[PDB]
Amino acid sequence: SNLLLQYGSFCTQLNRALTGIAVEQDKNTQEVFAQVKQIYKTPPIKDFGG
Amino acid sequence: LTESNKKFLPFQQFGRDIDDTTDAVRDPQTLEILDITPCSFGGVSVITPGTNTSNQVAVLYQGVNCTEVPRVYSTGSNVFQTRAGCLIGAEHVNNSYECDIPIGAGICASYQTSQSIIAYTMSLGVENSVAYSNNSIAIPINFTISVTTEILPVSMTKTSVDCTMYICGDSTECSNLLLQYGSFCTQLNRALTGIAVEQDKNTQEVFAQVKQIYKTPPIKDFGGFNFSQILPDPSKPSKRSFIEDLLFNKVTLADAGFIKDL
Amino acid sequence: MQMAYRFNGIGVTQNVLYENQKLIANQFNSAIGKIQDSLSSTASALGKLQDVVNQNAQALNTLVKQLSSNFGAISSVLNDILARLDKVEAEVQIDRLITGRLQSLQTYVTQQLIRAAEIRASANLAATKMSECVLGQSKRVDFCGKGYHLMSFPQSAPHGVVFLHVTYVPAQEKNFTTAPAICHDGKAHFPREGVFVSNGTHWFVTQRNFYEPQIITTHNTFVSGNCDVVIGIVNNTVYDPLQPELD
Amino acid sequence: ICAQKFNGLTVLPPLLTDEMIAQYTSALLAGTITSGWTFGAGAALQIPFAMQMAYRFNGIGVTQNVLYENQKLIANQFNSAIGKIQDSLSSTASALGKLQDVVNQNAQALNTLVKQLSSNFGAISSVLNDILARLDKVEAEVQIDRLITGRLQSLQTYVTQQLIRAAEIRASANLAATKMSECVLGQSKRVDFCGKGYH
Ligand SMILES: *[C@@H]1O[C@H](CO)[C@@H](O)[C@H](O)[C@H]1NC(C)=O
Ligand SMILES: *[C@@H]1O[C@H](CO)[C@@H](O)[C@H](O)[C@H]1NC(C)=O
Ligand SMILES: *[C@@H]1O[C@H](CO)[C@@H](O)[C@H](O)[C@H]1NC(C)=O
Ligand SMILES: *[C@@H]1O[C@H](CO)[C@@H](O)[C@H](O)[C@H]1NC(C)=O
Ligand SMILES: *[C@@H]1O[C@H](CO)[C@@H](O)[C@H](O)[C@H]1NC(C)=O
């Protein structure tokens, strides 16, 4: 651990970048699927003209 | 260490993962098969609503069976168990709301009313049905005109560097030592140049479509519809219009920067 | 007239714009006002723009701070390394220091290239938006604004572009009983440009985005087939402007 | 995954569970079979399914009379085609090649990180505790140094590769979003953007 501290901020930087990748993946999913607010439901009667 | 179920032949002795690390051992005295596992670590997340409102916080442990784990912090009550990990400072409320602060695996945290921090299973939207009768239609009886907004980044900031200056300050011997290595210093500079040029090009394509600079007629009578706010005012020294000027003031960077001699 | 040509595009006939001109004017003028107030308030709307400047600043600062790292030697100041050290030994410390700094520079330049590719993508999207939404009217759903898109006005901002999209949104809804086609005298008549609605008593034809009932004449219909195959045909009367003139 | 729990590669779980994702898609489906294309712009306006199909047919050019007259044929044709889709999807080789590919690629890189751990990196041993043993502090340090440099390099390589791959996945997401807006919430005139033929 002591030796690594001397090398510099080469542990802080790496951790930050990987966090970035993860949070952007969450944004991707939300954008593609969530575009309709009011959740709609199917009519019980299934009479869609054939 | 635990007792195993592995079947070692009398010459065999230790375990190995694809990582080639010992996973088991025979007691050199009882000759029994034991299984090794370092204790449970993870990483720590702190939830806070923001100092302005309060000074309470919540804690999450990125995945540990909190049925027995419990850094210098103390502990307390209100232990809750998600799939993501171990929360300390929420409540399994049976309501549900819109998600405010994300946590993971369908759990979202927030602050509310005596007021404390709470948690909930995130609900999506409000339910409603659409009466479908094979002979029913719905034509709107009027209309509404609305103006929305949209922001999109165009360019970054042109930067340049110098080898000898950064790597070897001004020492000539250091410069000779850098000269030993190949054209690393040279190639680097060219790449930074490429970025700078292309960044300027981007700006041109977006705005440069008008061939002739047109000018708005003096009389501003556009059939009732006013356009004063968006139309540039010559009286204002900066040709920028009201809305444009407001935008400029908001985005501030000189906080950690300097000025537009730099 | 320009607004009316654009209205025609989304579906509503020019009749609408000309008749209720005042109401349209008021709505547009008032909305522009709210946008000014919203920009002045909610100091989070300006998001993506500030983000760009924040990232570059952090990266620059990182490179500068790394200068103060032993990188596995004795000192940081190159002149101090030379001081109290024979050239031979100093060289090995200088060697280490150089490699350390060099690595950091390579990392920064790599990071910048990746980030600039994302900026390029954003600029190309804005170019398409300017060419389609500004210099024209786009029917691509949600590409410009939300709802049927009329016109769009461009404005400038620090290192970026802000588009103000103007859109028409249908509002208050009702309930009309409908039917596929109407049979008058054996031959079936299908709607020409609208949908046959019925307000309970008589039958009328209307546009598909605004209520304007007109009497079903031969001019607002086209004859085809015989009334028996159309699944749910109803029965009323097609006026036909002819006999009045003849007599 | 747990073996990765033994080295420091903690794989984090999702935020939106697959149950929630299913709910979202079902709402989009139950809006495009009942309220046409108004379920994205304004409020939902009910319309009989026969009529909705007629408007769409008018768009491609064929006049409405065709749909209302030969409705029977269209129905049977559509029903049979859905049958073929499910059959073919299950009865083929890969089909979902792209989806599977992403998983395999990410896994390969992760595995390579765990393998470089055992490399001597030009030293005497792989286990740092073993290096410490039978080595005087001074020499031990210079051997520890050799190992550290090697490992640091490997982790940096991994991070850079991941960032480049992440850009690719994000691009595919932006295309998908555009499709959900043009094809699902309406009808596309752009040729070959949604499907082969008239959409
Ligand atoms: C070692 O000690 C154990 C228990 O004290 C005994 O059973 C065994 O015979 C001894 N010798 C060897 C060779 O294991
Ligand atoms: C917490 O640990 C116990 C160990 O006894 C184990 O059953 C499980 O992982 C957790 N408890 C539950 C949820 O049964
Ligand atoms: C909350 O829900 C759980 C599970 O349904 C139930 O056991 C509990 O009593 C509920 N709490 C309240 C206050 O209703
Ligand atoms: C209308 O829907 C209902 C339910 O299926 C039923 O009366 C009938 O099948 C449909 N068609 C009519 C009434 O023409
Ligand atoms: C249409 O009429 C029915 C008749 O009861 C009513 O329940 C429904 O709310 C009406 N639709 C709208 C949008 O008001």
mmCIF file of all heavy atoms in Angstrom, chain C residues 67-107:
data_model
loop_
_atom_site.group_PDB
_atom_site.id
_atom_site.type_symbol
_atom_site.label_atom_id
_atom_site.label_comp_id
_atom_site.label_asym_id
_atom_site.label_seq_id
_atom_site.Cartn_x
_atom_site.Cartn_y
_atom_site.Cartn_z
ATOM 1 N N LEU C 67 2.603 16.169 -11.776
ATOM 2 C CA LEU C 67 4.010 16.654 -11.744
ATOM 3 C C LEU C 67 4.623 16.412 -10.361
ATOM 4 O O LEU C 67 5.809 16.048 -10.314
ATOM 5 C CB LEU C 67 4.047 18.145 -12.085
ATOM 6 C CG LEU C 67 4.365 18.474 -13.540
ATOM 7 C CD1 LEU C 67 4.414 19.976 -13.754
ATOM 8 C CD2 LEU C 67 5.674 17.829 -13.967
ATOM 9 N N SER C 68 3.852 16.609 -9.286
ATOM 10 C CA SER C 68 4.385 16.452 -7.906
ATOM 11 C C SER C 68 4.273 14.995 -7.445
ATOM 12 O O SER C 68 3.513 14.727 -6.494
ATOM 13 C CB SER C 68 3.703 17.396 -6.954
ATOM 14 O OG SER C 68 2.292 17.252 -7.008
ATOM 15 N N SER C 69 4.962 14.087 -8.134
ATOM 16 C CA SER C 69 4.968 12.660 -7.724
ATOM 17 C C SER C 69 6.395 12.128 -7.831
ATOM 18 O O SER C 69 7.034 12.347 -8.874
ATOM 19 C CB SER C 69 4.024 11.846 -8.561
ATOM 20 O OG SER C 69 4.291 10.458 -8.429
ATOM 21 N N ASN C 70 6.857 11.439 -6.792
ATOM 22 C CA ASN C 70 8.232 10.882 -6.801
ATOM 23 C C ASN C 70 8.359 9.857 -7.925
ATOM 24 O O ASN C 70 9.492 9.660 -8.393
ATOM 25 C CB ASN C 70 8.585 10.254 -5.456
ATOM 26 C CG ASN C 70 10.049 10.393 -5.100
ATOM 27 O OD1 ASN C 70 10.462 10.043 -3.998
ATOM 28 N ND2 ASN C 70 10.842 10.898 -6.027
ATOM 29 N N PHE C 71 7.254 9.207 -8.302
ATOM 30 C CA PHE C 71 7.277 8.163 -9.360
ATOM 31 C C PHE C 71 8.355 7.128 -9.025
ATOM 32 O O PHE C 71 8.983 6.592 -9.957
ATOM 33 C CB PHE C 71 7.501 8.793 -10.738
ATOM 34 C CG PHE C 71 6.332 9.545 -11.315
ATOM 35 C CD1 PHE C 71 6.486 10.845 -11.770
ATOM 36 C CD2 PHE C 71 5.087 8.950 -11.432
ATOM 37 C CE1 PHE C 71 5.417 11.541 -12.310
ATOM 38 C CE2 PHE C 71 4.019 9.648 -11.975
ATOM 39 C CZ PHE C 71 4.186 10.940 -12.413
ATOM 40 N N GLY C 72 8.559 6.854 -7.735
ATOM 41 C CA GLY C 72 9.560 5.858 -7.314
ATOM 42 C C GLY C 72 10.979 6.343 -7.534
ATOM 43 O O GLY C 72 11.689 5.701 -8.330
ATOM 44 N N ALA C 73 11.380 7.427 -6.862
ATOM 45 C CA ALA C 73 12.781 7.908 -6.945
ATOM 46 C C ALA C 73 13.198 8.496 -5.590
ATOM 47 O O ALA C 73 12.903 7.860 -4.561
ATOM 48 C CB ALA C 73 12.931 8.904 -8.067
ATOM 49 N N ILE C 74 13.855 9.662 -5.587
ATOM 50 C CA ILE C 74 14.244 10.321 -4.304
ATOM 51 C C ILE C 74 13.530 11.674 -4.169
ATOM 52 O O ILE C 74 13.034 11.948 -3.064
ATOM 53 C CB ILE C 74 15.777 10.461 -4.172
ATOM 54 C CG1 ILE C 74 16.430 11.080 -5.412
ATOM 55 C CG2 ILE C 74 16.411 9.126 -3.813
ATOM 56 C CD1 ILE C 74 17.194 12.352 -5.127
ATOM 57 N N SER C 75 13.474 12.477 -5.236
ATOM 58 C CA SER C 75 12.877 13.838 -5.159
ATOM 59 C C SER C 75 11.995 14.121 -6.379
ATOM 60 O O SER C 75 11.833 13.224 -7.226
ATOM 61 C CB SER C 75 13.959 14.876 -5.028
ATOM 62 O OG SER C 75 13.434 16.109 -4.558
ATOM 63 N N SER C 76 11.458 15.338 -6.465
ATOM 64 C CA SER C 76 10.596 15.713 -7.612
ATOM 65 C C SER C 76 11.312 16.748 -8.480
ATOM 66 O O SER C 76 11.366 16.549 -9.706
ATOM 67 C CB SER C 76 9.265 16.221 -7.140
ATOM 68 O OG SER C 76 9.423 17.332 -6.270
ATOM 69 N N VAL C 77 11.828 17.813 -7.864
ATOM 70 C CA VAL C 77 12.529 18.888 -8.626
ATOM 71 C C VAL C 77 13.708 18.263 -9.370
ATOM 72 O O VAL C 77 14.570 17.666 -8.705
ATOM 73 C CB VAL C 77 13.004 20.021 -7.699
ATOM 74 C CG1 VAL C 77 13.466 21.238 -8.482
ATOM 75 C CG2 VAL C 77 11.942 20.404 -6.680
ATOM 76 N N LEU C 78 13.728 18.390 -10.698
ATOM 77 C CA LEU C 78 14.810 17.771 -11.502
ATOM 78 C C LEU C 78 16.157 18.339 -11.054
ATOM 79 O O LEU C 78 17.118 17.563 -10.965
ATOM 80 C CB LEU C 78 14.548 18.055 -12.980
ATOM 81 C CG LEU C 78 13.554 17.098 -13.633
ATOM 82 C CD1 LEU C 78 12.982 17.695 -14.905
ATOM 83 C CD2 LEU C 78 14.208 15.752 -13.908
ATOM 84 N N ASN C 79 16.210 19.641 -10.778
ATOM 85 C CA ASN C 79 17.466 20.283 -10.311
ATOM 86 C C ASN C 79 17.870 19.686 -8.960
ATOM 87 O O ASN C 79 19.078 19.492 -8.748
ATOM 88 C CB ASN C 79 17.319 21.802 -10.248
ATOM 89 C CG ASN C 79 16.543 22.354 -11.425
ATOM 90 O OD1 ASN C 79 16.969 22.228 -12.570
ATOM 91 N ND2 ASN C 79 15.395 22.952 -11.154
ATOM 92 N N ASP C 80 16.895 19.413 -8.090
ATOM 93 C CA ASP C 80 17.193 18.791 -6.772
ATOM 94 C C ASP C 80 17.701 17.365 -6.984
ATOM 95 O O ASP C 80 18.593 16.954 -6.229
ATOM 96 C CB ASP C 80 15.978 18.811 -5.848
ATOM 97 C CG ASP C 80 15.932 20.049 -4.974
ATOM 98 O OD1 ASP C 80 15.803 21.155 -5.534
ATOM 99 O OD2 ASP C 80 16.036 19.897 -3.741
ATOM 100 N N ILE C 81 17.142 16.639 -7.956
ATOM 101 C CA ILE C 81 17.657 15.273 -8.273
ATOM 102 C C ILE C 81 19.144 15.409 -8.610
ATOM 103 O O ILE C 81 19.946 14.673 -8.012
ATOM 104 C CB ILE C 81 16.855 14.631 -9.421
ATOM 105 C CG1 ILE C 81 15.405 14.358 -9.008
ATOM 106 C CG2 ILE C 81 17.541 13.376 -9.942
ATOM 107 C CD1 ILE C 81 15.162 12.962 -8.488
ATOM 108 N N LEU C 82 19.489 16.341 -9.504
ATOM 109 C CA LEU C 82 20.910 16.566 -9.877
ATOM 110 C C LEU C 82 21.722 16.885 -8.620
ATOM 111 O O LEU C 82 22.822 16.316 -8.474
ATOM 112 C CB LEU C 82 20.975 17.728 -10.871
ATOM 113 C CG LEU C 82 20.220 17.503 -12.177
ATOM 114 C CD1 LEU C 82 19.962 18.820 -12.890
ATOM 115 C CD2 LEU C 82 20.974 16.538 -13.077
ATOM 116 N N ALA C 83 21.192 17.748 -7.749
ATOM 117 C CA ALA C 83 21.922 18.158 -6.527
ATOM 118 C C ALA C 83 22.205 16.950 -5.626
ATOM 119 O O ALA C 83 21.331 16.059 -5.539
ATOM 120 C CB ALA C 83 21.137 19.217 -5.798
ATOM 121 N N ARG C 84 23.377 16.929 -4.981
ATOM 122 C CA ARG C 84 23.761 15.834 -4.042
ATOM 123 C C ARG C 84 23.557 14.463 -4.699
ATOM 124 O O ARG C 84 23.007 13.569 -4.022
ATOM 125 C CB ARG C 84 22.986 15.942 -2.722
ATOM 126 C CG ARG C 84 22.865 17.353 -2.162
ATOM 127 C CD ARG C 84 21.430 17.809 -1.953
ATOM 128 N NE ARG C 84 20.430 16.860 -2.425
ATOM 129 C CZ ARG C 84 19.251 17.187 -2.943
ATOM 130 N NH1 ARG C 84 18.904 18.458 -3.066
ATOM 131 N NH2 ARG C 84 18.421 16.240 -3.339
ATOM 132 N N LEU C 85 24.012 14.298 -5.946
ATOM 133 C CA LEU C 85 23.904 12.989 -6.646
ATOM 134 C C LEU C 85 24.866 12.959 -7.835
ATOM 135 O O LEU C 85 24.822 13.899 -8.655
ATOM 136 C CB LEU C 85 22.465 12.786 -7.123
ATOM 137 C CG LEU C 85 21.955 11.347 -7.083
ATOM 138 C CD1 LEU C 85 22.590 10.569 -5.939
ATOM 139 C CD2 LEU C 85 20.442 11.315 -6.970
ATOM 140 N N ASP C 86 25.684 11.906 -7.929
ATOM 141 C CA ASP C 86 26.606 11.760 -9.087
ATOM 142 C C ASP C 86 25.784 11.540 -10.357
ATOM 143 O O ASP C 86 24.727 10.891 -10.266
ATOM 144 C CB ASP C 86 27.609 10.626 -8.872
ATOM 145 C CG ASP C 86 26.962 9.290 -8.563
ATOM 146 O OD1 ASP C 86 26.501 9.116 -7.418
ATOM 147 O OD2 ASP C 86 26.921 8.440 -9.471
ATOM 148 N N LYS C 87 26.271 12.040 -11.496
ATOM 149 C CA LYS C 87 25.529 11.928 -12.781
ATOM 150 C C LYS C 87 24.990 10.506 -12.961
ATOM 151 O O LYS C 87 23.789 10.383 -13.210
ATOM 152 C CB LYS C 87 26.422 12.314 -13.964
ATOM 153 C CG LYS C 87 27.924 12.189 -13.735
ATOM 154 C CD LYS C 87 28.604 11.165 -14.621
ATOM 155 C CE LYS C 87 27.815 10.802 -15.863
ATOM 156 N NZ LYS C 87 27.442 9.368 -15.876
ATOM 157 N N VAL C 88 25.844 9.491 -12.826
ATOM 158 C CA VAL C 88 25.423 8.072 -13.037
ATOM 159 C C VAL C 88 24.163 7.786 -12.219
ATOM 160 O O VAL C 88 23.167 7.343 -12.814
ATOM 161 C CB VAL C 88 26.551 7.094 -12.663
ATOM 162 C CG1 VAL C 88 26.313 5.712 -13.251
ATOM 163 C CG2 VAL C 88 27.921 7.619 -13.062
ATOM 164 N N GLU C 89 24.215 8.018 -10.906
ATOM 165 C CA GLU C 89 23.058 7.698 -10.028
ATOM 166 C C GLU C 89 21.885 8.620 -10.362
ATOM 167 O O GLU C 89 20.755 8.111 -10.477
ATOM 168 C CB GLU C 89 23.464 7.827 -8.562
ATOM 169 C CG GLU C 89 23.761 6.490 -7.911
ATOM 170 C CD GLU C 89 25.171 5.967 -8.131
ATOM 171 O OE1 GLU C 89 25.463 5.489 -9.246
ATOM 172 O OE2 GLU C 89 25.976 6.038 -7.182
ATOM 173 N N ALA C 90 22.150 9.921 -10.510
ATOM 174 C CA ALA C 90 21.086 10.882 -10.873
ATOM 175 C C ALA C 90 20.368 10.384 -12.127
ATOM 176 O O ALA C 90 19.140 10.431 -12.133
ATOM 177 C CB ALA C 90 21.673 12.255 -11.081
ATOM 178 N N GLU C 91 21.117 9.907 -13.124
ATOM 179 C CA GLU C 91 20.520 9.412 -14.391
ATOM 180 C C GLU C 91 19.425 8.390 -14.088
ATOM 181 O O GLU C 91 18.373 8.492 -14.710
ATOM 182 C CB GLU C 91 21.584 8.776 -15.281
ATOM 183 C CG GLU C 91 22.081 9.697 -16.377
ATOM 184 C CD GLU C 91 23.576 9.962 -16.351
ATOM 185 O OE1 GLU C 91 24.349 8.985 -16.278
ATOM 186 O OE2 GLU C 91 23.965 11.145 -16.394
ATOM 187 N N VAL C 92 19.677 7.434 -13.190
ATOM 188 C CA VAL C 92 18.661 6.366 -12.945
ATOM 189 C C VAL C 92 17.412 7.005 -12.322
ATOM 190 O O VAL C 92 16.301 6.610 -12.718
ATOM 191 C CB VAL C 92 19.224 5.182 -12.125
ATOM 192 C CG1 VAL C 92 20.717 4.987 -12.336
ATOM 193 C CG2 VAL C 92 18.886 5.221 -10.640
ATOM 194 N N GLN C 93 17.583 7.995 -11.439
ATOM 195 C CA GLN C 93 16.409 8.699 -10.865
ATOM 196 C C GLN C 93 15.736 9.511 -11.973
ATOM 197 O O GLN C 93 14.495 9.472 -12.053
ATOM 198 C CB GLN C 93 16.819 9.597 -9.699
ATOM 199 C CG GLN C 93 17.967 9.044 -8.869
ATOM 200 C CD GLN C 93 17.511 8.354 -7.607
ATOM 201 O OE1 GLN C 93 16.320 8.228 -7.332
ATOM 202 N NE2 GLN C 93 18.471 7.898 -6.820
ATOM 203 N N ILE C 94 16.526 10.207 -12.795
ATOM 204 C CA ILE C 94 15.962 11.001 -13.923
ATOM 205 C C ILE C 94 15.190 10.039 -14.826
ATOM 206 O O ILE C 94 14.035 10.345 -15.137
ATOM 207 C CB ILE C 94 17.071 11.757 -14.680
ATOM 208 C CG1 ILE C 94 17.704 12.847 -13.812
ATOM 209 C CG2 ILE C 94 16.547 12.340 -15.980
ATOM 210 C CD1 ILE C 94 19.020 13.357 -14.347
ATOM 211 N N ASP C 95 15.790 8.902 -15.178
ATOM 212 C CA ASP C 95 15.098 7.889 -16.013
ATOM 213 C C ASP C 95 13.709 7.628 -15.433
ATOM 214 O O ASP C 95 12.725 7.798 -16.175
ATOM 215 C CB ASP C 95 15.916 6.603 -16.109
ATOM 216 C CG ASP C 95 15.130 5.419 -16.644
ATOM 217 O OD1 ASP C 95 14.865 5.394 -17.862
ATOM 218 O OD2 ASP C 95 14.782 4.536 -15.837
ATOM 219 N N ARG C 96 13.638 7.242 -14.157
ATOM 220 C CA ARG C 96 12.329 6.919 -13.536
ATOM 221 C C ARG C 96 11.388 8.115 -13.681
ATOM 222 O O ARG C 96 10.280 7.927 -14.207
ATOM 223 C CB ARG C 96 12.510 6.568 -12.059
ATOM 224 C CG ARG C 96 12.349 5.084 -11.757
ATOM 225 C CD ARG C 96 13.684 4.404 -11.536
ATOM 226 N NE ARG C 96 14.586 5.199 -10.713
ATOM 227 C CZ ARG C 96 14.783 5.021 -9.412
ATOM 228 N NH1 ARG C 96 14.141 4.065 -8.763
ATOM 229 N NH2 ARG C 96 15.626 5.800 -8.761
ATOM 230 N N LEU C 97 11.816 9.294 -13.231
ATOM 231 C CA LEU C 97 10.932 10.482 -13.274
ATOM 232 C C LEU C 97 10.399 10.663 -14.697
ATOM 233 O O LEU C 97 9.174 10.811 -14.830
ATOM 234 C CB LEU C 97 11.720 11.707 -12.818
ATOM 235 C CG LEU C 97 11.506 12.119 -11.365
ATOM 236 C CD1 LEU C 97 12.174 13.454 -11.091
ATOM 237 C CD2 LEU C 97 10.025 12.193 -11.037
ATOM 238 N N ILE C 98 11.270 10.638 -15.711
ATOM 239 C CA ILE C 98 10.824 10.897 -17.113
ATOM 240 C C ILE C 98 9.708 9.917 -17.464
ATOM 241 O O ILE C 98 8.630 10.386 -17.862
ATOM 242 C CB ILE C 98 11.983 10.794 -18.117
ATOM 243 C CG1 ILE C 98 13.051 11.856 -17.870
ATOM 244 C CG2 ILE C 98 11.465 10.868 -19.543
ATOM 245 C CD1 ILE C 98 14.132 11.847 -18.914
ATOM 246 N N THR C 99 9.954 8.615 -17.310
ATOM 247 C CA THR C 99 8.940 7.606 -17.720
ATOM 248 C C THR C 99 7.607 7.912 -17.035
ATOM 249 O O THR C 99 6.579 7.857 -17.728
ATOM 250 C CB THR C 99 9.402 6.170 -17.443
ATOM 251 O OG1 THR C 99 9.676 6.019 -16.050
ATOM 252 C CG2 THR C 99 10.628 5.783 -18.242
ATOM 253 N N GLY C 100 7.630 8.223 -15.736
ATOM 254 C CA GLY C 100 6.398 8.558 -14.999
ATOM 255 C C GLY C 100 5.625 9.680 -15.670
ATOM 256 O O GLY C 100 4.451 9.459 -16.025
ATOM 257 N N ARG C 101 6.263 10.839 -15.849
ATOM 258 C CA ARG C 101 5.599 11.992 -16.510
ATOM 259 C C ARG C 101 5.109 11.574 -17.901
ATOM 260 O O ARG C 101 3.957 11.904 -18.226
ATOM 261 C CB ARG C 101 6.557 13.179 -16.592
ATOM 262 C CG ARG C 101 6.689 13.955 -15.293
ATOM 263 C CD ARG C 101 8.145 14.176 -14.947
ATOM 264 N NE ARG C 101 8.298 14.692 -13.597
ATOM 265 C CZ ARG C 101 8.860 15.855 -13.295
ATOM 266 N NH1 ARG C 101 9.327 16.636 -14.253
ATOM 267 N NH2 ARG C 101 8.949 16.237 -12.035
ATOM 268 N N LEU C 102 5.937 10.876 -18.685
ATOM 269 C CA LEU C 102 5.554 10.503 -20.074
ATOM 270 C C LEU C 102 4.250 9.711 -20.042
ATOM 271 O O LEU C 102 3.355 10.029 -20.837
ATOM 272 C CB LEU C 102 6.667 9.670 -20.709
ATOM 273 C CG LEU C 102 7.308 10.276 -21.954
ATOM 274 C CD1 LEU C 102 8.582 9.530 -22.317
ATOM 275 C CD2 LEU C 102 6.339 10.268 -23.124
ATOM 276 N N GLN C 103 4.160 8.719 -19.157
ATOM 277 C CA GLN C 103 2.935 7.887 -19.062
ATOM 278 C C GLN C 103 1.729 8.802 -18.864
ATOM 279 O O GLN C 103 0.750 8.651 -19.615
ATOM 280 C CB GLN C 103 3.061 6.893 -17.910
ATOM 281 C CG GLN C 103 1.791 6.105 -17.631
ATOM 282 C CD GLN C 103 1.513 5.042 -18.666
ATOM 283 O OE1 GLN C 103 2.394 4.279 -19.054
ATOM 284 N NE2 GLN C 103 0.270 4.981 -19.114
ATOM 285 N N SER C 104 1.813 9.726 -17.906
ATOM 286 C CA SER C 104 0.663 10.619 -17.610
ATOM 287 C C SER C 104 0.232 11.372 -18.874
ATOM 288 O O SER C 104 -0.979 11.408 -19.143
ATOM 289 C CB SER C 104 0.980 11.566 -16.491
ATOM 290 O OG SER C 104 1.378 10.853 -15.331
ATOM 291 N N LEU C 105 1.186 11.945 -19.612
ATOM 292 C CA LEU C 105 0.846 12.714 -20.836
ATOM 293 C C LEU C 105 0.071 11.809 -21.792
ATOM 294 O O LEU C 105 -0.980 12.249 -22.283
ATOM 295 C CB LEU C 105 2.130 13.224 -21.492
ATOM 296 C CG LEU C 105 2.307 14.738 -21.489
ATOM 297 C CD1 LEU C 105 3.544 15.132 -22.277
ATOM 298 C CD2 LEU C 105 1.076 15.428 -22.050
ATOM 299 N N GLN C 106 0.570 10.593 -22.036
ATOM 300 C CA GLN C 106 -0.098 9.662 -22.982
ATOM 301 C C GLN C 106 -1.550 9.464 -22.544
ATOM 302 O O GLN C 106 -2.437 9.577 -23.407
ATOM 303 C CB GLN C 106 0.641 8.329 -23.053
ATOM 304 C CG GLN C 106 1.590 8.232 -24.235
ATOM 305 C CD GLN C 106 1.615 6.845 -24.824
ATOM 306 O OE1 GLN C 106 2.674 6.287 -25.102
ATOM 307 N NE2 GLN C 106 0.439 6.271 -25.019
ATOM 308 N N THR C 107 -1.777 9.208 -21.253
ATOM 309 C CA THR C 107 -3.153 8.983 -20.742
ATOM 310 C C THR C 107 -4.034 10.185 -21.091
ATOM 311 O O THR C 107 -5.101 9.961 -21.676
ATOM 312 C CB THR C 107 -3.158 8.712 -19.236
ATOM 313 O OG1 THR C 107 -2.157 7.734 -18.953
ATOM 314 C CG2 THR C 107 -4.496 8.217 -18.736
#
